[PDB]
Amino acid sequence: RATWLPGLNPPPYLDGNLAGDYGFDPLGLGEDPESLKWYVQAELVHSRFAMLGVAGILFTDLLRTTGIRNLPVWYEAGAVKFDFASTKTLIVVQFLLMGFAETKRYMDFVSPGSQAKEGSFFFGLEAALEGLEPGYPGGPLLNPLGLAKDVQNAHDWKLKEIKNGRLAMMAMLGFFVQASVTHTGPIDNLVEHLSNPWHKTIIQTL
Amino acid sequence: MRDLKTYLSVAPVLSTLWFGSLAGLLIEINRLFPDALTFPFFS
Amino acid sequence: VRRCCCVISGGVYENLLFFPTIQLIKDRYPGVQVDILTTERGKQTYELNKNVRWANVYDPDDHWPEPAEYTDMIGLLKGRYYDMVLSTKLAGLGHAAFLFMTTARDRVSYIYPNVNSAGAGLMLSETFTAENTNLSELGYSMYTQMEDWLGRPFRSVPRTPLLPLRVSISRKVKEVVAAKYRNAGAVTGKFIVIHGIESDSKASMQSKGDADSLLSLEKWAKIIKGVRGFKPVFVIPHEKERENVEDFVGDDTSIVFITTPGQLAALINDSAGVIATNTAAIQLANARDKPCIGLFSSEEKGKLFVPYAEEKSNCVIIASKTGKLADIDIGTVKNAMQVFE
Amino acid sequence: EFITPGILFLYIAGWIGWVGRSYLIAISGEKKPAMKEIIIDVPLASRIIFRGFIWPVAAYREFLNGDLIAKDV
Amino acid sequence: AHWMPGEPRPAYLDGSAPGDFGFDPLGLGEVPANLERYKESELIHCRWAMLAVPGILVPEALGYGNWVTLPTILAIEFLAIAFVEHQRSMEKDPEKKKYPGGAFDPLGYSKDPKKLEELKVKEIKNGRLALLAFVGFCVQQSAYPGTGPLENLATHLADPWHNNIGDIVIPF
Amino acid sequence: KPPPIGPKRGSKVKILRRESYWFKNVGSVVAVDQDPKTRYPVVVRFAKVNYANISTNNYALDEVEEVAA
Ligand code: CLA
Ligand SMILES: CC1=C(/C=C/C(C)=C/C=C/C(C)=C\C=C\C=C(C)\C=C\C=C(C)\C=C\C2=C(C)CCCC2(C)C)C(C)(C)CCC1
């Protein structure tokens, strides 16, 4: 196959049957297999959060720059004081709810049958948490549509997921650094590049 | 030569190469970024 | 009940094996107008049933159907006013809601071992968890759960078989297939059908759970050279196999083009021998008492798809000693000489 | 004053330690390993020299997996 | 029957004990003797906290005392309580150290063993809940110096999405 | 017995002798004196020398223990 740079064999501890492999592990992090499993779940969650992030930034900035809604810049977006609720409450509520989410995901990763067997009451829903897979929980709660009912033979879907998500993570690092040394939004930097590309790049920042 | 590179990889020759490169690095940093007591970036 | 649907899935082979279930249903309650909502090439089996009423085409495994088509078929099942669904589509919620939107008294389905089957019990009066998620891979029977619940001991005997797979052909399909092999050099009593040819065609009638089920052609050239000619008619799934078979095994070798399973059973009913691999033709040969041999790629797979070889006493089963469909091609010729005469 | 350059230190210091440790483990399966501590296998180290970039996670896993600390036997 | 379904339950507590959910992540109850002493002390702490919490919110609902001299009341307290506590210490049967019965069990609740086990489960659950409630009282009095617990519940019910714990847990 | 009594030639073995340099360290059995009268037959060959620049030493059968690998 095509493994991330020709002229190099992929490492023998990862090949083929994994979501978008391409054999990039020059620093020997997926050498231990359980470490690779943990890192796969880490990658999937990271990429999905990053995809939601890139959507929530690009969409808001399309609304902002064009002028459909007066939303704040991604950089200066956290200090928006909401009337109904406060950020001091929102951090705690996020802690509670995302703890109930991520600890459940974890206890499934270490024990796949968990969260659905016995005394795992979530409003009587102890069946939507069957898991079916590590990193791909499935079930009526998590995939209501069920585009990939099967998940082992869904290599196209998982590959699309992981590729779009690697790219979204790289775009989020872009949002982090591009808007810490330029102090504008991504769409602003884009239209700055699409006016005079050979005069507005990273290195044209003196 | 294979043996010349075997000697260049010996501990003292490689140590002085490594520390000459490193010393040039720190030297040029303390010339370009002299007199440094505090890390001011995101301070 | 009086009106009963069937939302069966898979194609030729899975819907063929459902005939004892339909005969069980009509044996259970006296007059039932059974319907079928199957996939394409599933309707083509239902000339051979003498029991049922509509037998539509839906492709239930589409999983993103045309919403006009989806809404139309939901409303069609509502306008037929069923009493019992009997899905065996092997899906949960999303499809359990599809069976639930039908105004049905008895919502019955199959359910994943996985998660895409949760919240289905709410909308089904029977759960029927299955195995492998590749339901044809379970073998011949595939419906022992549904056979044992339909007709529980509540008043009388279950009667779960009634000499399983009694398919039946009519005179019209008999006449047209009679013309089709009479265009070949076959006599109406003395020939042998095959229906095993390596091809890329969906008329192969194999399974959902079998992969390497169809025998090759040069292996078949060895088989047809080792056997004496009792006029072996060759049943191709597509016309591009005709010249390929005439290149491999010869021009004198008769080729009968059959893609319809009703036409295939009509060609069974005039034959005197069957050299089928794991297709619909083994079960069609066991229907109407024709002596088969039943090639397979595994002894265990042959036991899963034929548990009744000891019963008919003609379908002397042959499989490969390894997997991968490479058998001896010798002793199968020997008991082909034994049982066909 | 201390904490950001302290992290900056510990990142480099653990880089040094981790590439050195993975090097000694790399040559441990040699016939005479000591000659690789004298005659430093520059290809091996250079393939490892950037493997200490990720030491805070690789070392954490080697601690969880049990590969950081050796067993007595 | 598990505090976090998925975690492996240790070998020394598996569901048989009255209040067993497998919450020993630090490994305190490894040995059996310390485990027995712990469940004794747990029941006693539980019963004291369950005596305490209705002695907090009931004065607060009507009296509003906020639950806030020495050399006589202290002496009478020590005299009245050391006697009972040492007489409790003088028992050696452990299931009778946790659940004496006899002169402590009127009304015949301990007459049927299955309901006895269910009521032990009820005691331990309500008691862990009450221990949490007392720790909540203490830390809510530490954070807010001069407010009552029911006063804090009124503060929450007024605007819950603006008066909650967050104000103290993070600097902002 | 005339058959071997001790570990096999090449069996990597651990030393339980508390006074040896290679205590709680693995070895490599190079020979076992099959004479049933010597006290320390197990001739081991270690990888790293002792303070006397010696990589081999005789050990007993009870002062030695083979590893699971
Ligand atoms: C251990 C005690 C000690 C300590 C703590 C210091 C500390 C310092 N000395 Mg003193 N000094 C000492 C002993 C000590 N010295 C001794 C024994 C001598 C006699 C030999 C001297 C003689 C001396 C002189 C004569 C001078 C100093 C100077 C300095 C300052 C150096 C700042 C600098 O240039 O670094 C900057 C940082 C570097 C050089 C390191 C760069 C590392 C590279 C870039 C890698 C990092 C990037 C990497 C990729 C990771 C990034 C993150 C991401 C990629 C993951 C600093 C306050 C200088 C100064 O300014 O005084 C205030 C100076 O003029 N010292
Ligand atoms: C915050 C701070 C502080 C303090 C701190 C402290 C107090 C700490 C402690 C700490 C501790 C108490 C620690 C401990 C540790 C332990 C251990 C036990 C460890 C181990 C480790 C290891 C083993 C590692 C290894 C390695 C690495 C990773 C690197 C390199 C390589 C090697 C291999 C070496 C102060 C205020 C002063 C200042 C500021 C900062």
mmCIF file of N, CA, C and O and ligand atoms in Angstrom, chain D residues 2-3 10 12-22 55-56 58-60 62-63 68-69, ligand 2:
data_model
loop_
_atom_site.group_PDB
_atom_site.id
_atom_site.type_symbol
_atom_site.label_atom_id
_atom_site.label_comp_id
_atom_site.label_asym_id
_atom_site.label_seq_id
_atom_site.Cartn_x
_atom_site.Cartn_y
_atom_site.Cartn_z
ATOM 1 N N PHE D 2 10.663 30.565 36.616
ATOM 2 C CA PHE D 2 11.018 29.176 36.898
ATOM 3 C C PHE D 2 10.170 28.143 36.172
ATOM 4 O O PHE D 2 10.723 27.186 35.624
ATOM 5 N N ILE D 3 8.850 28.309 36.146
ATOM 6 C CA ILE D 3 7.981 27.188 35.806
ATOM 7 C C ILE D 3 7.943 26.949 34.301
ATOM 8 O O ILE D 3 8.018 25.802 33.851
ATOM 9 N N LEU D 10 12.863 20.371 31.624
ATOM 10 C CA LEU D 10 12.507 18.977 31.852
ATOM 11 C C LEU D 10 12.145 18.270 30.560
ATOM 12 O O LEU D 10 12.439 17.083 30.409
ATOM 13 N N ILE D 12 13.618 18.854 27.595
ATOM 14 C CA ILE D 12 14.891 18.540 26.949
ATOM 15 C C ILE D 12 15.642 17.476 27.736
ATOM 16 O O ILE D 12 16.282 16.588 27.164
ATOM 17 N N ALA D 13 15.624 17.590 29.057
ATOM 18 C CA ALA D 13 16.345 16.654 29.906
ATOM 19 C C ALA D 13 15.771 15.252 29.773
ATOM 20 O O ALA D 13 16.517 14.268 29.686
ATOM 21 N N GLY D 14 14.444 15.142 29.726
ATOM 22 C CA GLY D 14 13.831 13.858 29.478
ATOM 23 C C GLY D 14 14.034 13.381 28.059
ATOM 24 O O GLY D 14 14.071 12.179 27.813
ATOM 25 N N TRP D 15 14.182 14.306 27.110
ATOM 26 C CA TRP D 15 14.595 13.923 25.764
ATOM 27 C C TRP D 15 15.946 13.223 25.803
ATOM 28 O O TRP D 15 16.116 12.141 25.230
ATOM 29 N N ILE D 16 16.919 13.848 26.465
ATOM 30 C CA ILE D 16 18.255 13.270 26.593
ATOM 31 C C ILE D 16 18.168 11.891 27.225
ATOM 32 O O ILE D 16 18.681 10.899 26.688
ATOM 33 N N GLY D 17 17.505 11.812 28.376
ATOM 34 C CA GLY D 17 17.404 10.545 29.071
ATOM 35 C C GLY D 17 16.684 9.481 28.268
ATOM 36 O O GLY D 17 17.086 8.320 28.267
ATOM 37 N N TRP D 18 15.617 9.858 27.566
ATOM 38 C CA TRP D 18 14.805 8.871 26.872
ATOM 39 C C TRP D 18 15.500 8.356 25.624
ATOM 40 O O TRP D 18 15.454 7.154 25.344
ATOM 41 N N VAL D 19 16.156 9.231 24.860
ATOM 42 C CA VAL D 19 16.898 8.742 23.704
ATOM 43 C C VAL D 19 18.080 7.900 24.161
ATOM 44 O O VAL D 19 18.387 6.869 23.555
ATOM 45 N N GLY D 20 18.722 8.277 25.269
ATOM 46 C CA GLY D 20 19.802 7.455 25.787
ATOM 47 C C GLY D 20 19.326 6.095 26.263
ATOM 48 O O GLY D 20 19.969 5.074 26.003
ATOM 49 N N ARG D 21 18.189 6.063 26.955
ATOM 50 C CA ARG D 21 17.648 4.804 27.449
ATOM 51 C C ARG D 21 17.207 3.905 26.304
ATOM 52 O O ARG D 21 17.482 2.701 26.310
ATOM 53 N N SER D 22 16.511 4.468 25.316
ATOM 54 C CA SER D 22 16.079 3.669 24.180
ATOM 55 C C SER D 22 17.263 3.226 23.337
ATOM 56 O O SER D 22 17.198 2.184 22.679
ATOM 57 N N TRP D 55 8.751 11.831 24.447
ATOM 58 C CA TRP D 55 9.016 11.149 25.712
ATOM 59 C C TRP D 55 7.929 11.306 26.776
ATOM 60 O O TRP D 55 7.691 10.327 27.501
ATOM 61 N N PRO D 56 7.243 12.447 26.948
ATOM 62 C CA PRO D 56 6.266 12.525 28.046
ATOM 63 C C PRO D 56 5.078 11.590 27.883
ATOM 64 O O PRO D 56 4.384 11.337 28.878
ATOM 65 N N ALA D 58 5.395 8.517 25.613
ATOM 66 C CA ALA D 58 5.976 7.186 25.506
ATOM 67 C C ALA D 58 6.418 6.674 26.867
ATOM 68 O O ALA D 58 6.199 5.507 27.197
ATOM 69 N N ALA D 59 7.032 7.538 27.674
ATOM 70 C CA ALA D 59 7.447 7.130 29.009
ATOM 71 C C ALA D 59 6.245 6.840 29.890
ATOM 72 O O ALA D 59 6.272 5.904 30.696
ATOM 73 N N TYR D 60 5.177 7.623 29.746
ATOM 74 C CA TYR D 60 3.976 7.365 30.527
ATOM 75 C C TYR D 60 3.386 6.006 30.180
ATOM 76 O O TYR D 60 2.984 5.249 31.071
ATOM 77 N N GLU D 62 5.100 3.439 28.855
ATOM 78 C CA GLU D 62 6.046 2.437 29.334
ATOM 79 C C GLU D 62 5.928 2.239 30.837
ATOM 80 O O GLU D 62 6.239 1.159 31.352
ATOM 81 N N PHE D 63 5.481 3.269 31.553
ATOM 82 C CA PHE D 63 5.201 3.137 32.975
ATOM 83 C C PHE D 63 3.900 2.379 33.206
ATOM 84 O O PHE D 63 3.813 1.558 34.125
ATOM 85 N N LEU D 68 8.813 0.863 31.559
ATOM 86 C CA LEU D 68 9.739 1.876 32.052
ATOM 87 C C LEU D 68 10.671 1.281 33.094
ATOM 88 O O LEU D 68 11.895 1.278 32.928
ATOM 89 N N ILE D 69 10.105 0.771 34.167
ATOM 90 C CA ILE D 69 10.860 0.158 35.247
ATOM 91 C C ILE D 69 11.066 -1.309 34.920
ATOM 92 O O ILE D 69 10.144 -1.999 34.468
HETATM 93 C C1 LIG G 2 5.377 22.879 41.365
HETATM 94 C C2 LIG G 2 6.715 23.483 41.681
HETATM 95 C C3 LIG G 2 7.269 23.369 42.903
HETATM 96 C C4 LIG G 2 7.280 22.083 43.665
HETATM 97 C C5 LIG G 2 7.150 20.870 43.090
HETATM 98 C C6 LIG G 2 7.281 19.573 43.810
HETATM 99 C C7 LIG G 2 7.301 19.465 45.319
HETATM 100 C C8 LIG G 2 7.406 18.472 43.025
HETATM 101 C C9 LIG G 2 7.600 17.106 43.533
HETATM 102 C C10 LIG G 2 7.753 16.089 42.671
HETATM 103 C C11 LIG G 2 7.989 14.674 43.081
HETATM 104 C C12 LIG G 2 7.841 14.259 44.529
HETATM 105 C C13 LIG G 2 8.328 13.806 42.095
HETATM 106 C C14 LIG G 2 8.617 12.385 42.295
HETATM 107 C C15 LIG G 2 8.965 11.602 41.283
HETATM 108 C C16 LIG G 2 9.233 10.192 41.592
HETATM 109 C C17 LIG G 2 9.613 9.233 40.722
HETATM 110 C C18 LIG G 2 9.831 7.852 41.287
HETATM 111 C C19 LIG G 2 9.857 9.498 39.277
HETATM 112 C C20 LIG G 2 10.343 8.578 38.445
HETATM 113 C C21 LIG G 2 10.614 8.943 37.055
HETATM 114 C C22 LIG G 2 11.239 8.137 36.173
HETATM 115 C C23 LIG G 2 11.665 6.729 36.531
HETATM 116 C C24 LIG G 2 11.526 8.740 34.847
HETATM 117 C C25 LIG G 2 12.484 8.253 34.050
HETATM 118 C C26 LIG G 2 12.924 8.863 32.779
HETATM 119 C C27 LIG G 2 12.326 9.875 32.163
HETATM 120 C C28 LIG G 2 10.862 9.848 31.864
HETATM 121 C C29 LIG G 2 13.130 11.044 31.681
HETATM 122 C C30 LIG G 2 14.389 10.560 30.982
HETATM 123 C C31 LIG G 2 14.483 9.048 30.899
HETATM 124 C C32 LIG G 2 14.216 8.350 32.218
HETATM 125 C C33 LIG G 2 14.182 6.849 31.921
HETATM 126 C C34 LIG G 2 15.280 8.755 33.235
HETATM 127 C C35 LIG G 2 7.937 24.603 43.500
HETATM 128 C C36 LIG G 2 6.940 25.349 44.374
HETATM 129 C C37 LIG G 2 9.161 24.244 44.328
HETATM 130 C C38 LIG G 2 8.497 25.485 42.391
HETATM 131 C C39 LIG G 2 7.529 25.686 41.242
HETATM 132 C C40 LIG G 2 7.320 24.334 40.605
#
